[PDB]
Amino acid sequence: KRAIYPGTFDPITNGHIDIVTRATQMFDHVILAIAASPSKKPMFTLEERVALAQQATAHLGNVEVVGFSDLMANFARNQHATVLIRGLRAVADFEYEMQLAHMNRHLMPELESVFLMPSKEWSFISSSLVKEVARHQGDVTHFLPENVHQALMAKL
Amino acid sequence: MQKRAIYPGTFDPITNGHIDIVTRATQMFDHVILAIAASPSKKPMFTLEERVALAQQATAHLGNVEVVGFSDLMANFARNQHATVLIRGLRAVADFEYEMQLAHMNRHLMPELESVFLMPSKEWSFISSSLVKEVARHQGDVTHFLPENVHQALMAKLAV
Amino acid sequence: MQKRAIYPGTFDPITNGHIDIVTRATQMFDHVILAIAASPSKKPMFTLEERVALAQQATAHLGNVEVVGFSDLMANFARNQHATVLIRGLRAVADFEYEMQLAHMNRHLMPELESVFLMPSKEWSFISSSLVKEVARHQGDVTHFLPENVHQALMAKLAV
Amino acid sequence: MQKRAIYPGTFDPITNGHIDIVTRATQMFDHVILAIAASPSKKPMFTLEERVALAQQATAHLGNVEVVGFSDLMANFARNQHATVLIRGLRAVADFEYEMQLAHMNRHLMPELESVFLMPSKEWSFISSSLVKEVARHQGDVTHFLPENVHQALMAKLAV
Amino acid sequence: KRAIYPGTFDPITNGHIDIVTRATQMFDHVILAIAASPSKKPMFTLEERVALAQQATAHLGNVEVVGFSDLMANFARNQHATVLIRGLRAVADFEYEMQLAHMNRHLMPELESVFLMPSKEWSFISSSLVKEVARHQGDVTHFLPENVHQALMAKL
Amino acid sequence: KRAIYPGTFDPITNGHIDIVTRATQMFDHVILAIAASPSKKPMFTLEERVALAQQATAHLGNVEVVGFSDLMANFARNQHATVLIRGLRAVADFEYEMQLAHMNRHLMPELESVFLMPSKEWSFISSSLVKEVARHQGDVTHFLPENVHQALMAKL
Ligand SMILES: Oc1cccc2nc(CCc3cccc(Cl)c3)[nH]c12
Ligand SMILES: Oc1cccc2nc(CCc3cccc(Cl)c3)[nH]c12
Ligand SMILES: Oc1cccc2nc(CCc3cccc(Cl)c3)[nH]c12
Ligand SMILES: Oc1cccc2nc(CCc3cccc(Cl)c3)[nH]c12
Ligand SMILES: Oc1cccc2nc(CCc3cccc(Cl)c3)[nH]c12
Ligand SMILES: Oc1cccc2nc(CCc3cccc(Cl)c3)[nH]c12
């Protein structure tokens, strides 16, 4: 049983770690799949985001980190994945998540989207919020893996 | 991984929306328990025995589905059944805040039980057992939303 | 086009918010039926006869409004009345998901009936018959939210 | 400014979420009245006398908190108590539209009373007295969500 | 009775077709009004969007397609329209729709905003989502009129 | 008792005036704090936004208008503020407001976020909406203080 957890992960946060950890407790193999996402003009290059996520998930034996620029549904088919994991924080996210999941189902009917709920601890954070605080030199050590925090400090 | 999943609800009665969710759950988990609550607080249209028999008949074609009634706190039942996955259907019209409250409470009660949210087909994304019953009680056509055995049982229930 | 529109609800009692919606509906459709549900499930404060008389008096100045009671599934009543438009008021505080469920169910029941959502004035965007009744029962001033005849009827109802 | 604030609710029973909100309110307002509604419509698990005593004991460490029962429209009670601030707790799972309806209605009733929304700790952002009671009635562990005196009272209530 | 259905329509989708068709069953004349929308940096020029919508709605006799750069309320007044149609997909859209409708009411009190609900089939699609899938070469034939699909393929 | 009311205020609207007025009826001193917000690419410079807000709030004796480029939580600590005011218009705003308030609480636990509800009159307006209408020469006199309206007319 192979699951894909796709996203921009710009950068990967403790919220993302929480979701991928939950996914590994449920599925045999989890592919953490980092989308290139040029339209979002990411802070970190795809190569940097992949390296950060690889380092942050090395303790989890059944996580494979990969980058992709393809249509997500095509990438999931090409990874032999039948489960698509997404984290569900709030209502505003849920509605866009429904659109994406219905589109993905149209593109690959056998790829089942599943939503996981993060810990209360990470229910109010996002990569965007963490970057905004860090741009103003605010302490974000609590929200990121150590290697990501260092990389964000170094980047800024 | 030999995962056991539970899909709890009142299933009063079981709809095509519930069939769609339980079908999707069987494609990703080895064993799925469709767990029917006594749900005395709501005062159900169908008795637990009727709800169980309707659900067994409607899911008989799915080999890895077990239909079972329960009267305890769902988390207590999931624990006793050795389930590690809790299936929740998320319709386009679901109370998202309530689902969050429920999942956090279930996680407090049984941390080893993971809540997983599945999405039904667009076809069943706007219905509920509640709306189906209300429409049928008021002489509306609900055949499209139900398994054939459920349609027959509901017609018989409303006739008396 | 000689469009017939229906504006259903419990109108228990009719408020300035309902008057605002029905007024807007008369400006765009030739004939508007303000359709009052028996709504026995909720157990209304005012009887159907009281609700109808209050609504007739409050809408008498609108020439193309017909106030009518109904006990069937609203879609069944809209079909029998040859209505092709179903008016729903959408307040800033409406249950959007419920409105979607209702409109899709109404479309399944009668495809030729189009649900149209109208927006009330900002003035009435945060009230409901439910909140108005609760406030009045608890000795609060609701005069501002009601037609004068409704204010008089509600005071008389609460006095006994 | 010698501000008097009111924090109304049914507190059936008072939870750690309510304690968190009332604590935050005492840090910004000089006097906080924790106002317990008779709330007969809901039919509460605990009587008003039980709810008041539980809340007094759970807030005794907060010097500027006064626990008081009330049976009038909350706005009528706030007016008589010379309160100019109305505390509302806003959980991650609150009915935002309902809070808006309530605040606008309270502003219509008493314009000099300002509704202020406080946010509880992430720890209590997904609970309610309703969910806590439901879980406890169904043999679930709710100790974590309640003050110790409330936990003892709830166990005694459910035992009989 | 004249109704205006305004939007960016970048490009027009089957969801938009569904709404305009419903609008023609209710009102005598429907103006499908395409806003220039430079702030949104559209994929298609106004002239292209107008031509695509004209071709896509030619089967509906009481639809007139027009482009505009004016304040929408002024354009509706200038078209003698008294009805403003908008499609209502989800909660997140509904709130911004309320702001726009209350502003339009302030600008032109007699222009009544009316919301129509799309078919379940088109309830999870948007021009943005279709463009995102098409940018990654994903199949969008199901969501667009034939002429629009060809034009989107040709544009990309 | 010192409260801070932070925001981009690009430009300050009658909705913002309504909130700051409510805040002064509750707290002894209110700092209306204008964030530089370069990421939002504001129409008005920080100096212009500060001057507009100063003029618009001069009638309120206990309002101090200040600009800032710092982390908001650091600025609140540096202003000796213990209350953070935000206006709550709708559901979509509420969710992002929760994230910001939980982050601010992590950065400064003693700074209490409080939400105030605007008048029905201003419940559907925003700086963005007012600028959009004004860009198309629509009448926005009703939504802005006189000095702001003149400045917006002059800017456009
Ligand atoms: O399969 C898909 C269906 C619908 C839209 C989609 N957009 C893509 C492009 C890749 C991408 C971009 C941003 C973020 C991610 Cl996780 C992936 N694939 C999609
Ligand atoms: O595990 C739980 C956690 C929180 C609340 C819940 N209430 C129950 C009681 C049983 C019940 C009632 C209605 C429907 C079902 Cl599926 C089950 N279990 C829950
Ligand atoms: O056409 C309908 C479709 C779906 C559900 C609905 N329930 C009814 C029953 C009648 C009713 C009850 C309360 C209020 C009114 Cl306005 C009407 N009609 C509906
Ligand atoms: O001032 C008010 C305005 C609007 C509605 C309200 N309903 C009441 C009645 C009393 C009550 C009932 C339940 C819970 C409480 Cl805290 C108070 N007061 C309200
Ligand atoms: O009448 C109006 C009221 C409020 C805002 C408005 N913005 C405009 C500009 C034209 C425009 C831009 C984008 C999309 C459309 Cl459909 C129209 N008119 C407006
Ligand atoms: O304390 C904070 C916590 C979380 C995010 C934050 N972003 C900032 C930067 C300043 C800023 C930018 C835009 C708008 C405002 Cl009101 C303030 N401070 C923050």
Residue C66 burial (C-beta neighbours within 10 Å; 0-12, 13-18, 19+) = middle
- Of F71, F95, F102, which is closest to A92 when you measure between CB atoms? F95
Ligand 4 pocket check for C137: Cβ under 6 Å: no
SS3 assignment, position C32:
strand
To one decimal, the resolution in angstroms is 1.9
Which three-class secondary structure state does DSSP give residue F18?
helix
Characterize D86-111 residue by residue with b for buried, 16 or more Cβ atoms within 10 angstroms of its Cβ, and e for exposed: bbbbbbbbbebbebbbbbbbbbbbbe
A72 is in an annotated binding site: yes
Q: Solving technique for this entry?
A: X-ray
Closest CA to F114 of F105, F106, F127: F105
Task: Give F144's DSSP letter.
Answer: S
Known active-site residue C91: yes
What six digits make up the tokens of E22? 């419903």
φ and ψ of D135, to 5 deg: -60, -50
CB neighbourhood size of F132 (10 A): 17
Q: Is residue A131 within 8 Å of B132, Cβ to Cβ?
A: no
Site of tokens 């028996």: C38
**Cα(F69) to centroid of ligand 4, in Å?**
43
Cα–Cα distance measured from residue A65 to residue A60, given in angstroms and rounded to the nearest whole number: 11
Question: What's the sign of the alpha-carbon dihedral F57, F58, F63, F68?
Answer: positive
In chain C, the domains with their CATH numbers are: 1-160 (3.40.50.620)
CB C126 within 8 A of CB D100: yes
Amino acid present at B68: V
* Alpha-carbon dihedral D93, D96, D101, D103, rounded to 10 degrees: 90
| C44 cis-preceded (ω within 30 degrees of 0) | no
The distance of Cα C150 from the centroid of its chain, to the nearest Å, equals 14
Q: Among candidates B124, B130, B157, which has minimal Cα distance to B42?
A: B130
Which of E126, E133, E139 is the best mutation test for A, with the most CBs of A within 10 A?
E133
Strand partners for D58: none
Q: Is residue D42 annotated as a catalytic residue, yes or no?
A: yes
Q: Are residues D119 and D112 in contact, defined by beta-carbon separation less than 8 angstroms?
A: no
Total Cβ atoms within 10 A of residue D128: 18
Token pair recorded at residue E41:
């940096």
Nearest chain F residue to E73 by CA distance is F138
Q: Measured between alpha carbons, how far is F40 from E104 in angstroms, rounded to an integer?
A: 25
Please tell me whether residue F2 adopts helix, strand or coil conformation: strand
* Chosen from C20, C93, C121, C122 to mutate, greatest number of chain F CBs within 10 A: C122
**Amino acid in the structure at residue F74:** N
Q: Which of A43, A38, A40 is nearest to A13 (CA)?
A: A43
Pair A95, B93: CB distance under 8 Å = no
**Residue D9, both tokens:** 């609710």
Please answer whether residues A17 and A98 qualify as being in contact, where contact means their C-beta atoms are separated by less than 8 angstroms.
no
Q: Give residue for tokens 């009528």.
A: D76
Distance CA B146, CA B127 (A): 11
Q: Which residue has the tokens 């707790």?
A: D89
Closest chain E CA to residue B123: E120
C-alpha B152 to ligand 2 mean position (Å): 29
Q: Which atom of ligand 6 is nearest to the CA of F33?
A: 16
E57 close to E65: Cβ distance less than 8 angstroms: yes
Inter-residue contact A117 to B106 (CB < 8 Å):
no
């329209």: which residue's tokens?
Answer: E81
Q: E strands within D49-142? A: 65-70, 85-89, 114-118
Task: Give the tokens for residue A111.
Answer: 């790829």
| Dihedral over alpha carbons F56, F60, F61, F62 (to 10 degrees) | -100
> Does residue B150 contact residue B11 with C-beta atoms inside 8 Å?
no
- Residue E74 to residue F126, Cβ atoms within 8 A: no
The residue in chain D having the minimum alpha-carbon distance to the alpha carbon of residue C132 is: D105
Q: What is the DSSP string of B52-70?
A: HHHHHHHHTT-TTEEEEEE
Judged by CB atoms closer than 8 Å, whether chains meet at B116 and A26 is answered as: yes
Calculate how close chain C gets to E113, using CA atoms only, in Å: 7
CB D132 within 8 A of CB D147: no
